[PDB]
Enzyme design. Structure first.
Site, PDB file in Angstrom:
ATOM      1  CB  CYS A 250     -29.874 -20.921  -9.595  1.00  0.00           C
ATOM      2  SG  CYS A 250     -29.125 -22.163 -10.697  1.00  0.00           S
TER       3      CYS A 250
ATOM      4  NE  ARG B 193     -32.404 -22.571  -6.641  1.00  0.00           N
ATOM      5  CZ  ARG B 193     -33.318 -22.180  -5.773  1.00  0.00           C
ATOM      6  NH1 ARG B 193     -33.144 -22.408  -4.466  1.00  0.00           N
ATOM      7  NH2 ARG B 193     -34.396 -21.523  -6.217  1.00  0.00           N
TER       8      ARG B 193
ATOM      9  CD1 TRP C  95     -26.802 -26.759 -18.594  1.00  0.00           C
ATOM     10  CD2 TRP C  95     -25.376 -28.115 -17.573  1.00  0.00           C
ATOM     11  NE1 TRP C  95     -27.532 -27.669 -17.876  1.00  0.00           N
ATOM     12  CE2 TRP C  95     -26.676 -28.511 -17.224  1.00  0.00           C
ATOM     13  CE3 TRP C  95     -24.283 -28.807 -17.015  1.00  0.00           C
ATOM     14  CZ2 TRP C  95     -26.925 -29.549 -16.332  1.00  0.00           C
ATOM     15  CZ3 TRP C  95     -24.530 -29.847 -16.163  1.00  0.00           C
ATOM     16  CH2 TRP C  95     -25.848 -30.210 -15.821  1.00  0.00           C
TER      17      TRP C  95
ATOM     18  CD  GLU D 122     -28.406 -18.422 -18.504  1.00  0.00           C
ATOM     19  OE1 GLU D 122     -27.780 -17.554 -17.846  1.00  0.00           O
ATOM     20  OE2 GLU D 122     -28.286 -19.665 -18.352  1.00  0.00           O
TER      21      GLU D 122
HETATM   22  C1  HEM Z   1     -25.704 -26.600 -14.287  1.00  0.00           C
HETATM   23  C2  HEM Z   1     -26.298 -25.718 -15.066  1.00  0.00           C
HETATM   24  C3  HEM Z   1     -26.854 -24.412 -14.622  1.00  0.00           C
HETATM   25  C4  HEM Z   1     -27.935 -23.753 -15.324  1.00  0.00           C
HETATM   26  C5  HEM Z   1     -28.612 -24.183 -16.575  1.00  0.00           C
HETATM   27  C6  HEM Z   1     -28.177 -22.592 -14.450  1.00  0.00           C
HETATM   28  C7  HEM Z   1     -29.139 -21.637 -14.852  1.00  0.00           C
HETATM   29  C8  HEM Z   1     -29.204 -20.319 -14.250  1.00  0.00           C
HETATM   30  C9  HEM Z   1     -29.994 -19.251 -14.891  1.00  0.00           C
HETATM   31  C10 HEM Z   1     -30.871 -19.258 -16.131  1.00  0.00           C
HETATM   32  C11 HEM Z   1     -29.856 -18.092 -14.031  1.00  0.00           C
HETATM   33  C12 HEM Z   1     -30.496 -16.747 -14.297  1.00  0.00           C
HETATM   34  C13 HEM Z   1     -29.349 -16.013 -14.998  1.00  0.00           C
HETATM   35  C14 HEM Z   1     -29.651 -14.673 -15.602  1.00  0.00           C
HETATM   36  O1  HEM Z   1     -30.797 -14.433 -16.014  1.00  0.00           O
HETATM   37  O2  HEM Z   1     -28.706 -13.847 -15.720  1.00  0.00           O
HETATM   38  C15 HEM Z   1     -28.919 -18.531 -12.978  1.00  0.00           C
HETATM   39  C16 HEM Z   1     -28.556 -17.619 -11.925  1.00  0.00           C
HETATM   40  C17 HEM Z   1     -27.733 -18.016 -10.814  1.00  0.00           C
HETATM   41  N1  HEM Z   1     -27.218 -19.252 -10.690  1.00  0.00           N
HETATM   42 FE1  HEM Z   1     -27.505 -20.996 -11.828  1.00  0.00          FE
HETATM   43  N2  HEM Z   1     -27.385 -22.417 -13.401  1.00  0.00           N
HETATM   44  C18 HEM Z   1     -26.623 -23.540 -13.442  1.00  0.00           C
HETATM   45  C19 HEM Z   1     -25.536 -23.818 -12.504  1.00  0.00           C
HETATM   46  C20 HEM Z   1     -25.225 -22.980 -11.343  1.00  0.00           C
HETATM   47  C21 HEM Z   1     -24.167 -23.340 -10.386  1.00  0.00           C
HETATM   48  C22 HEM Z   1     -23.256 -24.536 -10.464  1.00  0.00           C
HETATM   49  C23 HEM Z   1     -24.228 -22.270  -9.385  1.00  0.00           C
HETATM   50  C24 HEM Z   1     -23.413 -22.150  -8.150  1.00  0.00           C
HETATM   51  C25 HEM Z   1     -22.541 -23.057  -7.795  1.00  0.00           C
HETATM   52  C26 HEM Z   1     -25.321 -21.352  -9.764  1.00  0.00           C
HETATM   53  C27 HEM Z   1     -25.709 -20.163  -9.019  1.00  0.00           C
HETATM   54  C28 HEM Z   1     -26.542 -19.138  -9.549  1.00  0.00           C
HETATM   55  C29 HEM Z   1     -26.519 -17.809  -8.911  1.00  0.00           C
HETATM   56  C30 HEM Z   1     -25.842 -17.391  -7.637  1.00  0.00           C
HETATM   57  C31 HEM Z   1     -27.379 -17.040  -9.785  1.00  0.00           C
HETATM   58  C32 HEM Z   1     -27.814 -15.632  -9.721  1.00  0.00           C
HETATM   59  C33 HEM Z   1     -26.637 -14.786 -10.052  1.00  0.00           C
HETATM   60  C34 HEM Z   1     -27.083 -13.346  -9.944  1.00  0.00           C
HETATM   61  O3  HEM Z   1     -27.827 -12.902  -9.028  1.00  0.00           O
HETATM   62  O4  HEM Z   1     -26.660 -12.616 -10.815  1.00  0.00           O
HETATM   63  N3  HEM Z   1     -25.880 -21.725 -11.044  1.00  0.00           N
HETATM   64  N4  HEM Z   1     -28.419 -19.867 -13.112  1.00  0.00           N
HETATM   65  C1  LIG Z   2     -23.455 -20.312 -12.971  1.00  0.00           C
HETATM   66  C2  LIG Z   2     -24.390 -19.860 -14.049  1.00  0.00           C
HETATM   67  C3  LIG Z   2     -24.975 -20.760 -14.934  1.00  0.00           C
HETATM   68  C4  LIG Z   2     -25.810 -20.255 -15.938  1.00  0.00           C
HETATM   69  N1  LIG Z   2     -26.432 -21.042 -16.835  1.00  0.00           N
HETATM   70  N2  LIG Z   2     -26.046 -18.944 -16.038  1.00  0.00           N
HETATM   71  C5  LIG Z   2     -25.477 -18.043 -15.194  1.00  0.00           C
HETATM   72  C6  LIG Z   2     -25.829 -16.582 -15.433  1.00  0.00           C
HETATM   73  O1  LIG Z   2     -25.089 -15.573 -14.767  1.00  0.00           O
HETATM   74  C7  LIG Z   2     -25.096 -14.308 -15.453  1.00  0.00           C
HETATM   75  C8  LIG Z   2     -26.066 -13.404 -14.725  1.00  0.00           C
HETATM   76  C9  LIG Z   2     -26.182 -11.991 -15.300  1.00  0.00           C
HETATM   77  C10 LIG Z   2     -25.498 -11.036 -14.293  1.00  0.00           C
HETATM   78  O2  LIG Z   2     -26.277  -9.841 -14.021  1.00  0.00           O
HETATM   79  C11 LIG Z   2     -26.721  -9.446 -12.702  1.00  0.00           C
HETATM   80  C12 LIG Z   2     -25.708  -8.648 -11.891  1.00  0.00           C
HETATM   81  C13 LIG Z   2     -26.116  -7.442 -11.307  1.00  0.00           C
HETATM   82  C14 LIG Z   2     -25.215  -6.694 -10.549  1.00  0.00           C
HETATM   83  C15 LIG Z   2     -25.662  -5.399  -9.930  1.00  0.00           C
HETATM   84  C16 LIG Z   2     -23.910  -7.156 -10.374  1.00  0.00           C
HETATM   85  C17 LIG Z   2     -23.533  -8.363 -10.965  1.00  0.00           C
HETATM   86  N3  LIG Z   2     -22.268  -8.821 -10.798  1.00  0.00           N
HETATM   87  N4  LIG Z   2     -24.427  -9.081 -11.705  1.00  0.00           N
HETATM   88  C18 LIG Z   2     -25.154 -11.883 -13.069  1.00  0.00           C
HETATM   89  N5  LIG Z   2     -25.544 -13.233 -13.403  1.00  0.00           N
HETATM   90  C19 LIG Z   2     -24.643 -18.495 -14.180  1.00  0.00           C
HETATM   91 CL   LIG Z   3     -24.261 -14.863 -19.612  1.00  0.00          CL
END
Ligand code: HEM
Ligand SMILES: Cc1cc(N)nc(COC[C@@H]2C[C@@H](OCc3cc(C)cc(N)n3)CN2)c1
Ligand SMILES: [Cl-]
Ligand SMILES: C[C@H](O)[C@H](O)[C@H]1CNc2nc(N)[nH]c(=O)c2N1
Length: 362
Positions: A65, A68, A237, A242
């Site tokens: 992420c 963060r 947000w 994305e």
């Molecule tokens: C506040 C605005 C936020 C923005 C702009 C943001 C942005 C991102 C982006 C760009 C990714 C990569 C997503 C992808 O390529 O599919 C991501 C992944 C992630 N974010 Fe954040 N995020 C935000 C809030 C949060 C919050 C509040 C949490 C948890 C409480 C969080 C937990 C994660 C996790 C766990 C992943 C990876 C999920 C996965 O492996 O699929 N995000 N986020």
């Molecule tokens: C919280 C948050 C904020 C933000 N701006 N963007 C996100 C994006 O979450 C979507 C991505 C794309 C998804 O693909 C990966 C994936 C792989 C696999 C094997 C399982 C799974 N559930 N998800 C999971 N997270 C999440």
């Molecule tokens: Cl998405």
């Protein structure tokens, strides 16, 4: 052995948590309390303070992420009390509403009851709370292909989609003890959507693109000091890339680049014209413009990266290790224009954290 796991994760989590909260002296006593509970019940129950701080910590340890910087202002809703499907549904409606906040999005997590014996109390089938259906009818692709299997599983259970490219999936989930999940149509009044327009190019509206405002991940387990919250949807947000560079652009998703190319009046014939690159940029311009025109929170990948730089400085200045997954932190457009690209990250797993878990359908 699972008691030893739980106990150990409990010791490590409480020490870290109370140290951060300035409550170090309370640790011994709270740990003693916890040991009995685990001896007596085979588990333990987090305090409100702990649950909130674990949730935040878990975001702060999310290596993938970019967002963060804002970990500590996460808005934590505690719904360990829910016992009925109506209560789960209403919790999920409420989260959508309170997180959307008329466009001024709040980073929000709603936490339902943890697994017990690895037995889930609530099992949420959606990947995100708001997400579009996907169909593939004998050659015919409609909507979001990522959603194809969940859409088919919903349609088993007697839901039917209109088959637009942007049908909203119902909320679908299963309670402990029921053999089948239930589903509920989302009230349209709860879902903000944004039409995609371009600031200069009026014809962009001919594409009839849109996306939803709020990404609410509803299929990851939050783990905090040995406790497994499998149902704990969260949201931030969007970062514009994305939507603009994956959801609308990937060949396996909406695959709009050629159409983009046409409406912006370039040829999609020669790789050397960099038409995909030009199109991706205008589409991504579009996205950020439209979300801002509509009052819906969004961040561009440059501002996001700058914020993430600040998160890095903060960690070190707080004396904490930084972890990250470089491969996910880099944006999928102009990655080398961000500082992220030019350094390396330690991709270790630190708990608390969010984790994938098996999808019940498929
Ligand atoms: C506040 C605005 C936020 C923005 C702009 C943001 C942005 C991102 C982006 C760009 C990714 C990569 C997503 C992808 O390529 O599919 C991501 C992944 C992630 N974010 Fe954040 N995020 C935000 C809030 C949060 C919050 C509040 C949490 C948890 C409480 C969080 C937990 C994660 C996790 C766990 C992943 C990876 C999920 C996965 O492996 O699929 N995000 N986020
Ligand atoms: C919280 C948050 C904020 C933000 N701006 N963007 C996100 C994006 O979450 C979507 C991505 C794309 C998804 O693909 C990966 C994936 C792989 C696999 C094997 C399982 C799974 N559930 N998800 C999971 N997270 C999440
Ligand atoms: Cl998405
Ligand atoms: C497995 C392979 O590395 C895969 O393409 C990863 C790479 N980096 C990514 N980075 C982001 N932000 N999002 C993704 O979905 C992926 N996919």
């Amino acid at each position: 052995e699972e008691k030893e796991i739980l106990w150990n994760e409990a010791k490590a989590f409480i020490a870290a948590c109370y140290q951060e909260l300035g409550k170090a002296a309370e640790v011994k006593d709270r740990l003693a309390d916890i040991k009995s509970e685990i001896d007596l019940t085979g588990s333990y129950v987090h305090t409100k303070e702990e649950l909130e701080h674990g949730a935040k910590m878990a975001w702060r340890n999310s290596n993938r992420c970019i967002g963060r910087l804002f970990w500590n202002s996460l808005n934590v809703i505690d719904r360990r009390d829910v016992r009925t499907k109506e209560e789960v549904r209403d919790a999920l409606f409420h989260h959508i509403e309170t997180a959307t906040n008329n466009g001024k999005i709040r980073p929000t997590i709603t936490i339902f009851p943890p697994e017990e014996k690895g037995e889930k109390q609530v099992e949420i089938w959606n990947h995100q709370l708001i997400r579009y259906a996907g169909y593939e009818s004998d050659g015919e692709r409609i909507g979001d292909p990522a959603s194809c299997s969940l859409t088919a599983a919903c349609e088993e259970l007697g839901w039917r989609g209109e088959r637009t490219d942007f049908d909203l999936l119902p909320l679908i989930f299963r309670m402990k003890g029921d053999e089948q999940p239930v589903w509920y149509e989302l009230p349209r009044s709860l879902v903000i959507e944004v039409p995609i327009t371009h600031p200069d190019i009026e014809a962009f509206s001919d594409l009839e693109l849109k996306w939803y405002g709020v990404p609410i991940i509803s299929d990851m387990k939050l783990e905090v000091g040995g406790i497994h919250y499998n149902a704990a949807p969260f949201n931030g947000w969007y970062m514009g890339t994305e939507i603009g560079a994956r959801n609308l652009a990937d060949e396996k998703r909406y695959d709009k680049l050629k159409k983009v190319a046409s409406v912006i009046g370039i040829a999609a014939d020669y790789n050397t014209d960099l038409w995909k690159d030009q199109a991706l940029v205008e589409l991504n311009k579009a996205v950020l413009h439209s979300y801002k025109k509509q009052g819906v929170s969004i961040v561009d990948h440059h501002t996001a990266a700058s914020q993430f730089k600040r998160f890095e400085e903060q960690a070190e200045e707080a004396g904490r290790k930084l972890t990250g997954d470089w491969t996910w932190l880099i944006p999928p457009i102009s990655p080398a224009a961000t500082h992220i690209f030019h350094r390396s990250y330690d991709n270790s797993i630190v708990k608390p954290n969010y984790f994938y878990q098996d999808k019940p359908y498929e």
